[PDB]
Curated annotation (Swiss-Prot), chain A:
Changing residue 42 to L: In strain: Eta/B.1.525. It comes from the Viruses. Subunit of the fusion protein that is processed upon entry into the host cell. Mediates fusion of the virion and cellular membranes by functioning as a class I viral fusion protein. Contains a viral fusion peptide that is unmasked after S2 cleavage. This cleavage can occur at the cell membrane by host TMPRSS2 or during endocytosis by host CSTL. In either case, this triggers an extensive and irreversible conformational change that leads to fusion of the viral envelope with the cellular cytoplasmic membrane, releasing viral genomic RNA into the host cell cytoplasm. The chain holds residues 847 to 893 of 1273 of the full protein. This is Spike protein S2'.
Length: 47, 29
């Protein structure tokens, strides 16, 4: 068995994060869009 | 998962590391 499956049989479990990789990617895309289209106005008020 | 004893008494059970086959139900990651 792999390392994860061999360590889970002793109590050690890996909990999944709340924000998945897709949500972090969407957040980064939104930040990039705000930086390109607006600049610094979207981090201080209206875009 | 409990919304608080001051609001209601319903609870939700999450079994970490199962497939809804060895415990409505909802299968998540």
């Amino acid at each position: 068995r792999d390392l994860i499956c061999a360590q889970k049989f002793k109590g050690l479990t890996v909990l999944p994060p709340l924000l998945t990789d897709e949500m972090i990617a969407q957040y980064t895309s939104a930040l990039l869009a705000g930086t390109i289209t607006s600049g610094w106005t979207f981090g201080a008020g209206p875009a | 998962i409990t919304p608080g004893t001051n609001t209601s008494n319903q609870v939700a059970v999450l079994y970490q590391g199962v497939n809804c086959t060895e415990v409505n139900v909802f299968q998540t990651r």
